[PDB]
Amino acid sequence: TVAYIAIGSNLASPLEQVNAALKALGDIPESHILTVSSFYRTPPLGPQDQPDYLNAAVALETSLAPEELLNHTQRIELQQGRVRKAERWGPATLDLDIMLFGNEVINTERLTVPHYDMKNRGFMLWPLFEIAPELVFPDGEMLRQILHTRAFDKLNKW
Ligand SMILES: [Cl-]
Ligand SMILES: [Cl-]
Ligand SMILES: [Mg+2]
């Protein structure tokens, strides 16, 4: 099954963090990285000069069950980042989100696929469209269509 995973970092050298996260993701059992997007740059909300976010998307072929994949992504986040409690409202060392898992729809306390609000987050959709321009969401909506009809500025590259 192809899982699409969102990667985000705005602390401790994001280029270093995304690269470590990619390596970790690549090591997950019964899984293989199919494709990686370019790295995008998402500035913060606010003028106060806060660190920009590096965002990416990964196509991960996997024979794992969705909750099994989640066990590894959470593990990776916990081992590589999640250093201070403030990161939940503020800058983060590493965020790993499972965006999509094949055409599955999943709503458990643990795991919600498609990811919460992802259709309204260009920092997710732009890199996903780079690697999967023909993608169709589980409800039948085309990703391309979503980007042609919602108010997303083009994200600049890192
Ligand atoms: Cl850099
Ligand atoms: Cl959907
Ligand atoms: Mg392997």
Coordinates of C-alpha atoms and ligand atoms in Angstrom, one line a residue:
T1 CA 0.0 0.0 0.0
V2 CA 1.3 3.5 -0.7
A3 CA 1.4 5.7 2.4
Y4 CA 1.9 9.4 2.0
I5 CA 3.8 10.9 4.9
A6 CA 4.2 14.6 5.7
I7 CA 7.5 15.8 7.1
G8 CA 7.9 19.2 8.9
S9 CA 10.7 20.9 11.0
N10 CA 11.5 24.4 12.0
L11 CA 14.1 23.7 14.7
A12 CA 17.7 22.5 15.1
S13 CA 18.7 22.9 11.5
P14 CA 15.6 21.7 9.5
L15 CA 17.6 20.4 6.6
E16 CA 19.5 18.2 9.0
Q17 CA 16.2 17.1 10.6
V18 CA 14.4 16.2 7.4
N19 CA 17.3 14.2 6.2
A20 CA 17.5 12.2 9.4
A21 CA 13.8 11.6 9.3
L22 CA 14.0 10.3 5.7
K23 CA 16.7 7.9 6.7
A24 CA 14.6 6.7 9.7
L25 CA 11.5 6.3 7.5
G26 CA 13.6 4.4 5.0
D27 CA 14.6 1.9 7.6
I28 CA 11.1 1.0 8.7
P29 CA 10.5 -2.8 8.1
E30 CA 8.5 -4.1 5.1
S31 CA 8.6 -0.6 3.7
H32 CA 10.4 1.2 0.9
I33 CA 10.6 4.9 -0.1
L34 CA 9.2 5.3 -3.6
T35 CA 9.5 9.1 -3.9
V36 CA 10.4 12.2 -2.0
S37 CA 9.2 15.7 -2.8
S38 CA 11.4 18.8 -3.0
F39 CA 11.7 20.7 0.3
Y40 CA 9.4 23.6 0.7
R41 CA 9.5 26.8 2.9
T42 CA 6.6 27.8 5.0
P43 CA 7.0 31.1 6.9
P44 CA 5.3 31.5 10.3
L45 CA 2.2 33.4 11.1
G46 CA 3.3 36.7 12.5
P47 CA 5.9 39.4 11.8
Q48 CA 8.1 38.8 14.9
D49 CA 10.9 36.9 12.9
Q50 CA 10.2 33.2 13.7
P51 CA 11.9 30.3 12.0
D52 CA 10.5 29.1 8.7
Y53 CA 9.2 25.5 8.5
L54 CA 10.8 23.1 6.0
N55 CA 8.0 20.9 4.6
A56 CA 8.2 17.7 2.5
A57 CA 6.2 14.7 1.5
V58 CA 7.2 11.1 1.1
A59 CA 5.6 8.2 -0.9
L60 CA 6.3 5.1 1.3
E61 CA 5.4 1.7 -0.1
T62 CA 4.6 -0.5 2.8
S63 CA 3.1 -3.9 3.8
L64 CA 2.6 -2.7 7.3
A65 CA -0.9 -2.1 8.8
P66 CA -1.7 1.5 9.2
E67 CA -1.5 1.4 13.0
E68 CA 1.8 -0.4 12.6
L69 CA 3.2 2.4 10.4
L70 CA 2.0 4.9 13.0
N71 CA 3.9 3.0 15.7
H72 CA 7.1 3.7 13.7
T73 CA 6.3 7.3 12.8
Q74 CA 5.6 8.2 16.4
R75 CA 8.6 6.3 17.5
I76 CA 10.7 8.3 15.1
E77 CA 9.3 11.6 16.2
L78 CA 9.9 10.7 19.9
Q79 CA 13.4 9.6 19.4
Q80 CA 14.5 12.3 17.0
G81 CA 12.6 15.4 18.3
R82 CA 9.8 16.3 20.8
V83 CA 12.4 17.8 23.1
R84 CA 10.2 20.4 24.8
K85 CA 6.4 20.6 25.6
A86 CA 6.2 24.0 23.9
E87 CA 6.7 22.4 20.5
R88 CA 2.9 21.5 20.6
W89 CA 2.0 25.2 20.1
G90 CA 5.3 26.4 18.7
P91 CA 8.3 25.5 16.6
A92 CA 9.1 21.8 16.3
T93 CA 12.2 19.8 15.7
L94 CA 10.2 17.2 13.7
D95 CA 6.6 16.6 12.9
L96 CA 5.7 13.3 11.0
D97 CA 2.1 12.9 9.8
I98 CA 0.5 10.1 7.9
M99 CA -1.5 11.9 5.3
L100 CA -3.0 9.1 3.3
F101 CA -2.8 5.3 3.4
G102 CA -3.8 3.9 0.0
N103 CA -7.5 4.6 -0.4
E104 CA -8.3 3.8 3.2
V105 CA -10.5 5.9 5.5
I106 CA -9.6 5.5 9.2
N107 CA -11.1 7.1 12.2
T108 CA -9.8 5.7 15.4
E109 CA -8.6 7.6 18.5
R110 CA -5.1 6.7 17.5
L111 CA -5.3 7.3 13.8
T112 CA -7.4 9.5 11.4
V113 CA -6.7 9.1 7.7
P114 CA -7.0 11.3 5.7
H115 CA -5.1 13.5 8.1
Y116 CA -6.9 16.2 9.9
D117 CA -7.5 19.3 7.7
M118 CA -4.9 18.3 5.1
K119 CA -7.1 19.5 2.3
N120 CA -6.7 23.1 3.7
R121 CA -2.9 22.9 4.2
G122 CA -0.9 23.9 1.2
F123 CA 2.3 22.9 3.0
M124 CA 1.0 19.4 2.8
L125 CA -0.7 19.6 -0.6
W126 CA 2.0 21.2 -2.7
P127 CA 4.7 18.6 -2.0
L128 CA 2.1 15.8 -2.3
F129 CA 1.1 17.1 -5.7
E130 CA 4.7 17.2 -6.7
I131 CA 5.1 13.4 -6.1
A132 CA 1.5 12.3 -6.9
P133 CA -0.1 14.7 -9.4
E134 CA -2.8 12.2 -10.4
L135 CA -3.7 11.4 -6.8
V136 CA -7.4 10.9 -5.9
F137 CA -8.5 11.2 -2.3
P138 CA -10.6 8.4 -0.8
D139 CA -13.8 10.5 -1.3
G140 CA -13.2 10.8 -5.0
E141 CA -11.8 14.3 -5.0
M142 CA -8.7 15.0 -7.2
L143 CA -5.7 16.6 -5.5
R144 CA -5.1 18.8 -8.6
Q145 CA -8.7 20.0 -8.4
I146 CA -8.3 21.0 -4.8
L147 CA -5.3 23.1 -5.7
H148 CA -7.1 24.7 -8.6
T149 CA -10.0 25.7 -6.3
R150 CA -8.6 26.6 -2.9
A151 CA -6.7 29.8 -1.8
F152 CA -3.2 28.5 -1.7
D153 CA -0.3 30.7 -2.5
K154 CA 2.5 28.7 -4.3
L155 CA 4.9 27.6 -1.6
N156 CA 8.5 28.6 -2.4
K157 CA 11.2 25.9 -2.2
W158 CA 13.6 25.8 0.7
Ligands
CL1 CL 19.4 24.9 5.1
CL2 CL -11.1 12.2 1.4
MG3 MG 14.4 -1.9 4.7

